[PDB]
């Protein structure tokens, strides 16, 4: 329940409309109750007056009251919906960008603690549920309570005993019934929040891996596990319906209780006079109509159990501390970058052994260095240390004889160009898949680099405008490899880290690309991890890594001589 405090502070940035949507809710309920309360008394007072009391009884003022309350009822409810929803969905905006803003600072290792399909649930689905806090958990509660006080105070002039009797039934219902259903529905709301995110994870994982699951016959046996989550999810939805059904039944029974009591009690006397006259219908119709103030409160605390469960999930994500932090010291990007590593060691999270054991190399500016080794020997773990993916443990990495931890993030990204081993093709257009690096490039610059890497047939038909990735054209294994090279070429950073750039390319294209990298990367520091011994005679040094440590180091000509 205390998990909602960080999100009640977002009420402040829209305190004018959010509070206006509550004042207009009280006004609507007071006019809605007044319409029935005034109409009920008007008929009875008119009936007692009869034909004889035509002139003595004032029949114009009450006639205007029922007409005025009928317009306040319909105009008030229309605007309080517009005002409350318009402000609620702009608070939802900040809640979604604020939640999304936390994902990239903790990208490589913080996001590995979660499953992607369940993270998609938090940002897109759980944020929407947590936004239900004002519309149907807060506005009903405080709007109803004020109406209880106004009705009880207003009726108190007529008769104290009857007023606190109706108020007592109504105010006691408001304070002890919602908590009772919160305790009853708290467990269901946690299971209903947990299983919606569990189904979305098991579905997106099932859909994304459908190539392998289909060939090996695991599609059916993974869908069965997916269907079991839906069965549990549908039972939680069913148990929620049982509580909603029972909650409405009790309010209708409590709704009967006051009407019966007002009928019974007011008959004895209203205001201390044994002959109440029309005053009996004033209390009965007030009790019959005032319950619509307690209508939204019925399921308000059944929303609460699910809102708090969501609030826990987002508060979990937004309270994570990224293990890599960057200073705010602005600095100018260098034009030549030379980096030194001295006994840098790194242990991956929740592990015992060391991925990197005392790597130590000094790469001068303008040097091209090739890193070789077995699979799993730490080659791509090294290239992420240079990118500040994690912080090294009792090691030191220096860029241009200055610590890599002292660089601003905006300046660190401009000094390093990376070709990852696992290229990603975003859903965006061909233009937008290349504007990740060098956003300011023109379409001629984009189209120029596409022909340089050999993707001239991506400019066919729609070309730059054509959609790529999921929902569009998918690229082959070799085309994805040359799209990452086109990104790094556009970035034009002083230091370039290539992670097997010519992987999955045939002999002809690989030579065509390696020749392209020779002239484009000239006078640039290059750390190119490869598994192919072809064309290493152009590299100033060759690094051979084994089990997270450098074994051999020197020129290709030197390495062959020493065997």
């Amino acid at each position: 329940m205390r998990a909602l405090l960080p999100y009640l502070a977002l009420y402040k940035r829209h305190k004018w409309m959010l509070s206006l949507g509550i004042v207009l809710a009280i006004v609507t309920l007071l006019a809605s109750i007044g319409l029935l309360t005034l109409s009920g008394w008007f008929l009875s007072a008119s009936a007692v007056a009869g034909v004889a009391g035509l002139y003595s009884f004032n029949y114009m003022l009450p006639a205007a009251g029922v007409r005025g309350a009928a317009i306040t009822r319909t105009a008030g409810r229309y605007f309080e919906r517009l005002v409350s929803h318009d402000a609620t969905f702009r608070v939802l905006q900040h809640l979604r960008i604020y939640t999304f803003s936390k994902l990239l600072p903790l990208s490589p290792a913080g996001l590995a603690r979660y499953r992607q399909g369940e993270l998609l649930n938090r940002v897109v689905a759980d944020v929407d549920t947590l936004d239900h806090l004002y519309l149907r958990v807060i506005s009903p509660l405080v709007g109803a309570f004020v109406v209880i006080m106004v009705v009880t105070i207003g009726l108190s002039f007529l008769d104290f005993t009857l007023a606190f009797t109706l108020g007592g039934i109504m105010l006691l219902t408001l304070f002890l019934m919602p908590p009772l259903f919160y305790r009853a529905g708290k467990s269901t709301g946690q299971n209903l929040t947990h299983l919606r995110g569990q189904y979305r994870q098991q579905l997106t994982a099932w859909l994304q891996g459908q190539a392998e699951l289909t060939i090996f016959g695991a599609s059916d046996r993974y869908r069965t596990q997916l269907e079991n989550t839906e069965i549990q999810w549908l039972e939680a939805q069913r148990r929620q319906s049982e509580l909603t059904a029972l909650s409405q039944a009790i309010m209708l029974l409590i709704g009967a209780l006051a009407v019966i009591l007002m009928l019974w009690m007011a008959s004895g006397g209203v205001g201390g006079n044994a002959q109440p006259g029309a005053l009996i219908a004033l209390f009965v119709f007030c009790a019959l109509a005032a319950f619509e103030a307690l209508a939204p409160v019925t399921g308000a605390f059944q929303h609460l159990g699910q809102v708090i469960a969501s609030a826990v999930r987002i508060s979990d994500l937004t309270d994570q501390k990224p293990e890599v932090t960057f200073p705010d010291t602005q600095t100018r990007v260098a034009d030549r970058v030379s980096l030194t590593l001295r006994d840098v060691q790194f242990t991956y999270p929740e592990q015992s052994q060391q991925a990197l054991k005392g790597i130590s190399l000094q790469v001068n500016a303008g040097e091209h260095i090739a890193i070789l080794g077995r699979t799993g020997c730490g080659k791509s773990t090294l290239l992420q240390q240079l990118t500040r993916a994690w912080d090294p443990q009792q090691g030191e990495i220096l860029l241009n004889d200055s610590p890599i931890a002292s660089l601003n993030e905006a300046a660190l990204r401009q000094t390093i160009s990376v070709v990852p081993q696992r290229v990603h093709l975003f859903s965006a257009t061909l233009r937008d898949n290349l504007l990740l690096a060098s956003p300011g490039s023109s379409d001629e610059a984009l189209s120029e680099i596409l022909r340089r890497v050999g993707l001239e047939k991506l400019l066919e038909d729609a070309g730059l405008n054509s959609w790529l990735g999921e929902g569009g054209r998918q690229l082959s294994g070799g085309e994805l490899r040359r799209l990452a090279i086109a990104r790094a070429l556009l970035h034009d950073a002083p230091l370039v880290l290539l992670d097997q750039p010519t992987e999955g390319l045939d002999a002809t294209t690989e030579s065509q690309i390696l020749e392209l990298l020779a002239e484009m990367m000239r006078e640039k520091t290059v750390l190119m991890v490869t598994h192919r011994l072809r064309g290493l005679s152009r590299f100033q040094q060759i690094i051979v890594m084994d089990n997270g440590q450098i074994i051999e180091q020197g020129t290709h000509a030197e390495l062959l001589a020493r065997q």
Binding site: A47, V51, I97, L103, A249, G268
Partner: protein
């Protein structure tokens, strides 16, 4: 398109025949709530007249109080039943709609699943199907109650006053009219609402999967603006959908609030003598005024609810547009093949003017003419982007083809998909690991495999050498997108899958990707042995080693331009020799 909406509504209404017994009970229970409301109003009005006009003390009125209490208890019980009866109607239909969609996603394959982002499939299955609940739970039973209950109320008022009954029907006909003109665009507004949500959800999970690339290039500030734009399009669609509901509900409350005013004014005036026409030539009673005033809100309740649930129907029509399109579009094959080859012996592959097309329709591989006798092994060789992986995706049943591609003389379209995939195992390009642990991934073909047969796959695919590095050994989780493993370590786990279950056809799409010169040799000696047990087609680029494979297919621009054995092709010049020339320098 209003023609499309009727097609969606016909589709939505067909899916409600599973829970027909549930909808009929709710209609009956809603009608019973109509009778109980009239009975409650009659007793409350009769009681009030006795106490006020005729001044009977309450100690005489016990029968009307007892019957009023019984009516209230019956009212609450029917409300309790109708809420639960309505839910079961919606749940069983939603469970059946989702099963049909998940059935077609099984048959779609990776090629048709890649036609929509995975975060947009999720909102299609979760949000769009769950948002048809109120169409089935609440709207379908309400169409009958919107006509039965209001007429039941007015028939109970004609004996009292013929004018108070005409006041309700005076304002009644405007309510159905205004409900439709306001809601003429409510179904398209919802369709664009679920389109912006699907666009927002797919955009998010795309940036989440590729968040490593975003971090490399420093797209932290740029991707916050893309989410802000996607989330603001979605917000404006939601507010557009909601504004119709508030307007429609405000209009219906305007007539409801107006009618109560006239009933109060007309009766209040009639008791005072300013009006005489309403009553049946007899003095107006107080019970008649109270009866028509308690029943005035309940005459429109069944009509306000219909307006409330009408926009729930528009929410289902908007949610069914993307669903019906997915059901409409044909999959990789026009009709689900039922034929199945019997023998587990190696299959024969025969192509005749074969053309392979993408889901959209673009041709990926040109005219392919080749023959692969049973038990023989072939190698696909060529430039990048020349259609080598497309052919292997056609042989897996993932892509639609135009010519002829016969397996043991049987057209691959006609083969049963589930039966055909049991004779086929292969390593894909950029392979993925869907399971949780590393053992669960290697044992994907058959989870209940003997530890000895599990060990053979781990040893053959060189997976057993890096097992000590892992904390839990072979039971360690591989993570999301195999993050715990390296690219070369995950590649060998993919190779372990293909070698565990023997099958009739083995395909290989760069099985030794991202493996050094030594670990590749360990893997290739396993695959060279495993390629002799059945028909094999391997897409590789190591032109040097393959001196023993039965035939080589050099593919260029989607066509097999050179087929032959490695001995003659290496010396006959042409595309293969030149392609090998750039190799080995």
């Amino acid at each position: 398109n209003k023609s499309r909406q009727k097609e969606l509504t016909r589709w939505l209404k067909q899916q409600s025949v599973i829970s027909q017994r549930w909808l009929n009970i709710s209609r009956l229970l809603g009608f019973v709530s109509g009778i109980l409301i009239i009975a409650q109003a009659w007793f409350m009005a009769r009681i009030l007249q006795h106490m006020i006009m005729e001044n009977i003390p309450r100690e005489a009125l016990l029968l009307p109080f007892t019957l009023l209490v019984l009516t209230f208890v019956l009212r609450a019980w029917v409300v309790w039943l109708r809420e639960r009866v309505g839910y079961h109607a919606g749940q069983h239909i939603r469970f059946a709609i989702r099963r049909q969609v998940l059935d077609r996603l099984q048959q779609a394959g990776p090629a048709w699943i890649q036609g929509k982002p995975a975060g947009s499939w999720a909102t299609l299955v979760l949000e769009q199907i769950d948002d048809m609940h109120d169409y089935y739970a609440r709207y379908l039973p309400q169409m009958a109650l919107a006509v039965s209950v209001p007429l039941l109320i007015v028939v109970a008022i004609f004996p009292s006053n013929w004018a108070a009954a005409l006041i309700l029907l005076g304002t009644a006909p405007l309510i159905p009219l205004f409900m439709a003109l306001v809601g003429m665009g409510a179904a398209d507004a919802n369709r664009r609402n679920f389109l912006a949500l699907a666009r927002l959800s797919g955009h998010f999970l795309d940036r989440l999967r590729g968040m490593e690339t975003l971090r490399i290039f420093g797209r932290g500030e740029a991707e916050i603006e893309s989410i802000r734009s996607a989330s603001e399009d979605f917000r404006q669609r939601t507010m557009e959908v909601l504004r119709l509901a508030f307007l429609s509900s405000g209009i219906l409350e305007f007539f409801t609030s107006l009618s109560i005013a006239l009933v109060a004014v007309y009766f209040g005036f009639s008791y005072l003598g300013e009006l005489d026409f309403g009553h049946y030539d007899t003095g107006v009673t107080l019970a008649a005024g109270f009866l028509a005033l308690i029943l005035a809100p309940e005459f429109f309740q069944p009509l306000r609810d219909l307006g409330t649930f009408y926009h729930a129907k528009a929410q289902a029509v908007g949610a069914a547009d993307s669903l019906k399109t997915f059901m409409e579009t044909p999959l990789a094959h026009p009709q689900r093949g039922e034929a199945e080859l019997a023998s587990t012996d190696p299959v024969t592959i025969e192509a005749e003017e074969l053309f392979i097309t993408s889901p959209e329709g673009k041709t990926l591989a040109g005219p392919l003419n080749f023959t692969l006798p049973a038990g023989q092994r072939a190698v696909l060789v060529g430039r990048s982007g020349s259609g080598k992986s497309s052919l292997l995706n056609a042989l897996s049943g993932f892509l639609s083809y135009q010519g002829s591609l016969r397996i043991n003389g049987i057209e691959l379209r006609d083969l049963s998909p589930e039966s055909w995939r049991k004779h086929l195992s292969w390593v894909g390009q950029n392979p993925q690991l869907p399971a949780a642990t590393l053992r669960d991934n290697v044992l994907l073909a058959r989870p209940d495999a003997s530890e000895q047969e599990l060990q053979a796959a781990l040893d053959n695919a060189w997976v057993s050498e890096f097992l000590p590095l892992l904390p839990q050994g072979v039971d360690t989780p591989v993570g999301d997108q195999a993050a715990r493993l390296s690219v070369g370590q995950a590649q060998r786990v993919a190779v372990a899958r293909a070698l565990l279950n023997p099958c009739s056809l083995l395909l290989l799409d760069e099985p030794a990707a991202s493996l050094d010169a030594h670990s590749e040799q360990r893997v290739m000696e396993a695959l060279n042995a495993a390629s002799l047990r059945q028909t094999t087609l391997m897409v590789t680029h190591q032109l040097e080693d393959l001196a023993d494979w039965d035939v080589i297919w050099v593919m260029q621009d989607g066509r097999i331009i050179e087929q032959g054995r490695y001995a003659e092709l290496s010396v006959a010049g042409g595309p293969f020799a030149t392609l090998l020339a750039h190799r080995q320098e």
